[PDB]
């Protein structure tokens, strides 16, 4: 019945979104409950940030000196603080839109949807892996720092990143909601360059597993193999290493299919040596990673939110 | 700074969506001011979807037999009758959430955001195109039905999609607001099947254009060509033929790169005759078609709505 790349309704995290300008800079902010959170560098010109001290910076800042609005709306700062990488600055007014929400560190691997903005206003909205490497491939452009993301389970709103940076090659970086950068990166605008990007394996299994069931059955080879022997393959391909955890999380799917977890790696294994030889699967002809397990079933069962 | 598949953001709809049940089949309607929108089928039961009469099954339907919660509140339909395929049931509350909307039936090739939804609730949210053959490669299951597509420019919703059902091919048919199928399919459950799903050659010219903004150029080749040159070549690779008027559209995009549209053109013959030897185009390898020129500015300059 289908599969496709699919982000949460984003309708609650719409309420929250406000411009903050400081000085000459201006960029997006979260407001939740009387609080609005935003990159510490919206306070950096562009010639600071080659070597900003964000400390000092700070001294010559005043609640005044924070300009948010809401739609056309001023909020009245009463207070404003650093933490880590984020300022938060304490508001007179509870947003009334609040959702129930909280703030999450992800694991690699982990997906969720992003909210691009741009002075306040939603642009659009799409799903993202925290790669590997702590990277994220995002779509974002001048002003769309302090854009969101989030996963919503129910009525509950999981915030998990906040967007900083791009880096020369255009892929992006950013922290969690509590201030700290995924990764090793730094919002200083010099020399940093991401990793290997490694592949998400336990992902690509939980898509093939998807593809089986909505009807893309061509690769399912007839060999089984070990953890042990998949990962040699995997390793000269940059697949991440896949542990007995990952064969548990998979354990669902696998019941669902009937095909054992091995089995399906065997498969893998030689699509990664052989090819996909111009086939596709689920109209890709690269092996997706950016699906969870819990992505998968999500979809392919109908669980809905508000 | 990076290239997604992004939809709108999906807020203004979600306070449209909600649960009508008739008899023993729930689907979604879509409420706006004091009408509820939603698929005629839901007066069959699964037996009926062969061959339907809705004339003779709407007689012994009346306002209180179709039941309709939003959240946990009951609307009192007031009224209700058939448009085309749809059936618009009279409420006696307008929607306080109502958005400024309009209907819009799309012309094939052309992009919308899909509101996967289940029992009135939201699910998730994607792009999809409509495809030459009038299907769309979409996510829906049972109960997925009334689920609609939208387009957002500023403030203002154009529906162009409600979702009515899924060929034994596994793609998706549908209506635009006024209840009118796109392409031939019925709301009945028989023998029919989708032509040739031609790829969009004006889209997938916007998107190299996207690709050459963001760095990957390697397939800027050193010809040009013409339109009936380059059409002789798209046809027997299932080609839309490119048109004057695609040209024309094209004008913005050519403008910013520098490119000529027959140069692109003739470097797009060359990937249709000698594949992709193994490369990427932003991150996929296969072209891709979901992208109007229309949407590449959008996303490459950073146009906001609210
Ligand atoms: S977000 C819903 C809930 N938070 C949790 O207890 C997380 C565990 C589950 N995701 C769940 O039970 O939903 C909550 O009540 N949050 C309220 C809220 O706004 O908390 C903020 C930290 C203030
Ligand atoms: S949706 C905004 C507008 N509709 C138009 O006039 C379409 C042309 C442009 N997209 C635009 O000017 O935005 C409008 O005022 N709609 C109001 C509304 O709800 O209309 C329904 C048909 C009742």
Same mark, same amino acid.
């Given at each position: ?9 984003? /309708?609650?995290?719409?309420? #929250? ?6 000085? !000459? !800079? ?17 306070? #950096? ?71 691009? #903005? ?21 779509? *974002? ?17 999981? *915030? ?8 020369? !090659?255009?892929?992006?970086? /950013? ?9 090793? *990166? ?8 991401? =990793? ?29 193999? !070990? ?23 998979? =354990? ?5 299919? =009937? ?22 699967? +689920? /109209?890709?002809?690269? +092996? ?19």
């Amino acid at each position: 019945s289908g599969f496709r790349k699919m982000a949460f309704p984003s /309708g609650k995290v719409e309420g #929250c979104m406000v411009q903050v300008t400081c000085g !000459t !800079t201006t960029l997006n902010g979260l407001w939740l409950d009387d609080v609005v959170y935003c990159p510490r560098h919206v306070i #950096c010109t562009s010639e600071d940030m080659l070597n900003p001290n964000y400390e000092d910076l700070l001294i010559r800042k005043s609640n005044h000196n924070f300009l948010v609005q809401a739609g056309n709306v001023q909020l009245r700062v009463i207070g404003h603080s650093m933490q880590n990488c984020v300022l938060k600055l304490k508001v007179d007014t509870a947003n009334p839109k609040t959702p129930k929400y909280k703030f999450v560190r992800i694991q690699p691997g982990q997906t969720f949807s992003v909210l691009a #903005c741009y002075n306040g206003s939603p642009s659009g909205v799409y799903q993202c892996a925290m790669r590997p490497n702590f990277t994220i491939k995002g779509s *974002f452009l001048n002003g769309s720092c302090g854009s969101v993301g989030f996963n919503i389970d129910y009525d509950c709103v999981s *915030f998990c990143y906040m967007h900083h940076m791009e880096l020369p !090659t255009g892929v992006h970086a /950013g922290t969690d909601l509590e201030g700290n950068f995924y990764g090793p *990166f730094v919002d200083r605008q010099t020399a940093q360059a991401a =990793g290997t990007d490694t592949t998400i394996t336990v992902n690509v299994l939980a898509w093939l597993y998807a593809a089986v069931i909505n009807g893309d059955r061509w690769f399912l080879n007839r060999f089984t193999t !070990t953890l042990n022997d998949f990962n040699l393959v995997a390793m000269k391909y940059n697949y991440e290493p896949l542990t007995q955890d990952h064969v548990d999380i998979l =354990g669902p799917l696998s019941a669902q299919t =009937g095909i054992a977890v091995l089995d399906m790696c065997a498969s893998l294994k030689e699509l990664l040596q052989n090819g996909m030889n111009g086939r596709t699967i +689920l /109209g890709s002809a690269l +092996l997706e990673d950016e699906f969870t397990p819990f992505d998968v079933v999500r979809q392919c069962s109908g669980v809905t939110f508000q």
